[PDB]
DNA sequence: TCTTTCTATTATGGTCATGCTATGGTACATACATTCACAAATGTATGTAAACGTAACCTCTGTAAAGTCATTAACCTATGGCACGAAAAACCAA
């Protein structure tokens, strides 16, 4: 979380100088980190989301759709 | 001793189904050990030879049962010879 926080607020403060978004080649030229393990910290930290994320307008579309289980396998294998 | 005027939960359907997914950040400094990842050695492992025995297995001579053909004579068409029963001639009675 600290690490986290830390490459937050300096991708803050070079999308506030540069103008752009920050590409993270240029914080493991600053952090002396490499590469792998800024991709590693970017790409753990997410929320994830929950099991009801109303779509549309109508009180029909919700999940518990488009979601398969794949531990029940096919009943052709098992034939 | 008794009926109205207010303060809060239930209720009305689903079938035919839709697309594109995140939304603002807010500190570091010692710490000691659990865990992942490689060196190197054991142990049972697998795959290459070699010996005995019978799975046998064809080859050949002897015993045995089955088609056929030597006898010999039983019956059976022939031949000769003698009764036999039919067919015609004859003669008698009315």
Same mark, same amino acid.
């Given at each position: /979380?600290?690490? /986290?926080?830390? *490459? ?6 070079? *999308? ?15 952090? *002396? ?10 790409? /753990? ?9 109303? /779509? ?15 531990? *029940? ?7």
């Amino acid at each position: /979380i600290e690490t /986290i926080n830390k *490459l937050n607020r300096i991708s803050r403060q070079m *999308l506030q100088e540069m103008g752009r978004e920050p590409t993270p080649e240029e914080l493991a030229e600053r952090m *002396l980190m490499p590469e792998d393990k800024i991709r590693k910290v970017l790409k /753990i930290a997410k929320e994830p989301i929950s099991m009801e994320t109303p /779509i549309g307008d109508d009180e029909d579309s919700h999940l518990g759709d488009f979601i398969e289980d794949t531990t *029940l396998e096919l009943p052709l294998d098992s034939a």
